[PDB]
A paper describes a structure:
[name] functions as a homo-dimeric enzyme that catalyzes the rate limiting step in the primary salvage pathway for NAD synthesis, the transfer of a phosphoribosyl residue from 5-phosphoribosyl-1-pyrophosphate (PRPP) to nicotinamide (NAM) to produce nicotinamide mononucleotide (NMN). Crystal structures of [name] in numerous ligand-bound forms have been reported. These structures consistently display a [name] homo-dimer with two essentially identical active sites at the dimer interface. Typical [name] inhibitors were found to occupy the portion of active site responsible for NAM binding and a tunnel-shaped cavity extending from the NAM binding site. Furthermore, we determine the crystal structures of six [name] mutants in the apo form and in complex with various inhibitors and present a definitive model to explain the differential effects of the mutations on various structural classes of [name] inhibitors.
The RD cell line with the [name] mutation is almost 1000-fold resistant to [name]-618, but only10-fold and 100-fold resistant to APO866 and GMX1778, respectively, demonstrating that inhibitors from distinct classes are differentially affected. Cell lines harboring [name], S165Y, or G217A are preferentially resistant to [name]-618 compared to GMX1778 and APO866. The identification of resistance mutations in S165 was surprising because this residue does not lie within the drug-binding pocket. However, the part of [name] structure that is responsible for inhibitor binding is not affected by the S165 mutations. However, expression of [name]/Y mutant [name] allows cell survival in the presence of [name]-618, implying that the mutant [name] retains a level of enzymatic activity to support sufficient NAD production for cell survival. However, expression of [name] or S165Y mutant [name] proteins in a naïve cell line resulted in decreased sensitivity to [name]-618, indicating that these mutations are sufficient to cause resistance to this [name] inhibitor.
Author numbering:
A (entry chain A): 8 to 43, 53 to 382, 389 to 487
B (entry chain B): 8 to 42, 53 to 383, 388 to 487
């Protein structure tokens, strides 16, 4: 079973002995620190952490003893605030005396703004605020995944709109292929849920169950897939029988969309001779609701996509849409799922546009770090001897690492943007309502968002228009 | 509860229908495909076998669950309910799969077979690649273990050159990465991979994982000591940094303590606060209880060098037998900002050039490694259809680097004592001695395992082996 007493950075076990004596409050905040482009971030994923790890009776006698035993060996010393944890157990039935206030999930907020704050609700637990920094800071991952996919969606939207005149199918243009490529089963679920804030096509099944458990959708599921081959289902037929594999597979899935990886031996031969001649009669007969989706999976991503389109355009009837761009027949599409990151995605759609190919023709299949958006948790306010003091770091050699001072609040500006007020200036009430809401207090999740609301919050402007 | 029927890439749910008719065997393998990082540490499969693959992993409820989910996910009935029911009924939900692997901790050159997977029942030909997704995640502990071993080689080289020995090497790179990984589970797995190489960690999650899945003779595989963070310094107020420092070193007067010193001005903190105002509290400390000063901002190399020069002028420095400068034993430095394998190299070389021993410094690790770094990859190499075995492979025209191995594979020692992978069942010709892979999983049971102590021994540096 998960033990919150064992879910912090080791050194934090020793911090209760280091704060100023007579400190009754430690108040901390999380931001995606501005850096002297990723100018706005999607706040997403805190609700998962709150429910899975922070809520309810998270302290027990057994958990305290377990931690005591582990830390004794780990530190070769008895340092461990057994009394402090006992107090939470006895006084609060093992519920964390913490209040967390956060911007609503799905909100798109410029860099350098307070996203959530954390403080102890009982003076005895001044040490607890930063104990849980480690676990809360891992919110950097769903925030950065949600943000990065939103930025990729902006690129796709721009090019789809320009080449087609509309945004039809946009939410299925970037399919999550990343399950095998992440570091763990837990990460797979979290990352997939963040992808699904932006898109609806996924092969990372783990994301569905996480969304259902922690967030919820009106629809039975938040994400979808369709049949497709992998190299093993093609190569198993033998090198001389690729055509036989293709035929079997498209015939098995004759009435649903089917994607078929076509580069096992020679992608260009597969497109021109196998799909484009030998099996063409099985493709042109397919429904608009059940296209063949050809998947190249190797070579230079841009060069290969363009050459594949060029080949298919000469073997199948191409039309020109009202924007002047070339469009494959509705029973035939292409998906590129090799080497697609935000930079290469841009390169491909731009390259397609230059060659007069509509983005309607293509879909894509998809490391990020905590430093990308400078996700950071810092103490900004403490009360010592009954006096509040505004605290901060400001390293001489790096002004980019300066932190905010005092009690914080987030507000709409008169022009409708965002501003973070420091030093308790929100109390002056010159800027309307604080946009941070209490989401956790004393062991209870106090405000929750559905996955539907989060998706709405995270919409692109071009979608709103 | 984890459900293996829901732990694969969605498209794999449809593959049972796509293999050639009458296929009785699918056989696949994992390698770190050949294209720095010429040898990889094989580590982490044992966790996956025990946590996810062994025992009764199929139940009626899990089958119904997957059926319901996939019906909505695919907007159609495509899920192989019958195939999973067969495993439930015939094998009491244990997977009819055999896995053979190189021993955990082994250091093996790129492009060798590391593990193989095949079905042991003809009805379950589709099962081999169902579990590709789960098994391929072994890329992460392999890559973490490998990258940290490569960092250890750099540290060993420079520590040996500047001090004449390797004392303290296993405490020279401390894991600071708990907050910077993607999940609690990843934290435990990644920390365990770090601990294959080192013994100092702040990622507590790693200890319990090692204890549960691997085991050590010692109570714990990794250690830490007290240290400050910016909040425990800055909480005292901007004008009271000295008061914070004094309190902390006094609270931890008889154990090692690390104090971050860059909250406002690292150079002033070192020269005036530590080096003058509080010097009397430092020079009185035991060799077993040093102050470890931690800069945490600025150019990592430039900052380390300036911090050492400052301390060198305020504290008595000696010259060791190799001619390098050494701080007194009650005083050390740790650099935990911006340290990846490249910057680690730049710092130790920069120190060497300025005649500072590597004894003076430790590093904190806390750059993202991906599955592409070592080209970790799982591919089908052999199938049996209509009773005939066939050697299979991909070989994409535009990328020869993605060509996969053919046929049944085995791992062997060459006459010179190196590794070679034999393809096309050639291992059976008995010209290269015994297959070095061991069966580690068969029919729902883990059949061979390794303690964490043995894994560490397997992963040792040559320089450590002397
Ligand atoms: O092909 C794969 N999965 C199936 C798949 C995914 C995505 C598409 S798609 O063309 O985006 C598409 C088409 C129609 C409906 C949907 C829908 F509405 F359902 F989203 C998605 C079609 C098929 C695949 C391929 N390679 C992989 N490597 N690692 C994981 C992988 C997964
Ligand atoms: O200082 C931190 N943790 C405590 C710590 C770690 C490492 C050292 S060390 O100097 O390598 C050292 C010294 C003596 C014994 C050990 C031993 F034998 F115990 F390993 C380690 C001393 C203290 C720390 C600092 N910043 C962090 N950011 N994110 C996580 C962080 C952890």
């Amino acid at each position: 079973e998960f033990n919150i007493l064992l879910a912090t950075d080791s050194y934090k076990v020793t911090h209760y002995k280091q704060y100023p004596p007579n400190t009754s409050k430690v108040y901390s905040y999380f931001e995606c620190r501005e850096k002297k482009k990723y100018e706005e971030t999607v706040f997403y994923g805190l609700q998962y952490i709150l429910n899975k790890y922070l809520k309810g009776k998270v302290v027990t006698k057994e958990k305290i003893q377990e931690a005591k035993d582990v830390y004794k060996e780990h530190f070769q010393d008895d340092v461990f605030n057994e009394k402090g944890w006992n107090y939470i157990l006895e006084k609060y039935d093992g519920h964390l005396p913490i209040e967390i206030k956060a911007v609503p999930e799905g909100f798109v907020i410029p860099r350098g703004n307070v996203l959530f704050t954390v403080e102890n609700t009982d003076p005895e637990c001044y040490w607890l605020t930063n104990w849980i920094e480690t676990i809360l800071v891992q919110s950097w991952y769903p925030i950065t995944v949600a943000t990065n996919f939103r930025e990729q969606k902006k690129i796709l939207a721009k090019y789809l709109l320009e080449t087609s005149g509309n945004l039809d199918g946009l939410e299925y243009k970037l399919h999550d292929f990343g399950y095998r490529g992440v570091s763990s089963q837990e990460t797979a679920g979290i990352g997939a849920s963040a992808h699904l804030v932006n898109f609806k096509g996924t092969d990372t099944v783990a994301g569905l169950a996480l969304i259902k458990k922690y967030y919820g959708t009106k629809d039975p599921v938040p994400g979808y897939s369709v049949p497709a081959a992998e190299h093993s289902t093609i190569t198993a037929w033998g090198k001389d029988h690729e055509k036989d594999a293709f035929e079997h597979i498209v015939t098995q899935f004759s009435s649903v969309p089917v994607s078929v990886v076509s580069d096992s031996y020679d992608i260009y031969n597969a497109c021109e001779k196998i799909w484009g001649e030998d099996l063409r009669h099985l493709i042109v007969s397919r429904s608009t609701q059940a296209p063949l989706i050809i998947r190249p999976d190797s070579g230079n991503p841009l060069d290969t996509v363009l050459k594949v389109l060029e080949i298919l355009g000469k073997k199948f009837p191409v039309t020109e849409n009202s924007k002047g761009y070339k469009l494959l027949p509705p029973y035939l599409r292409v998906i590129q799922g090799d080497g697609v990151d935000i930079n290469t995605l841009q390169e491909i759609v731009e390259g397609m546009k230059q060659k007069m190919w509509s983005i309607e023709n293509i879909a894509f299949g998809s490391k990020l770090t905590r430093d990308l958006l400078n996700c950071s948790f810092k103490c900004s306010y403490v009360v010592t001897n009954g006096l509040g003091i505004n605290v901060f770091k400001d390293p001489v050699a790096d002004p980019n690492k300066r932190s905010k001072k005092g009690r914080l609040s987030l507000h709409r500006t008169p022009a409708g943007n965002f501003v973070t007020l420091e030093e308790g200036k929100g109390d002056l009430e010159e800027y309307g309502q604080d946009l941070l809401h209490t989401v956790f207090k004393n062991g209870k999740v106090t405000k929750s968002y559905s996955f539907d609301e989060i998706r709405k919050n995270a919409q692109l402007n071009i979608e709103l228009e």
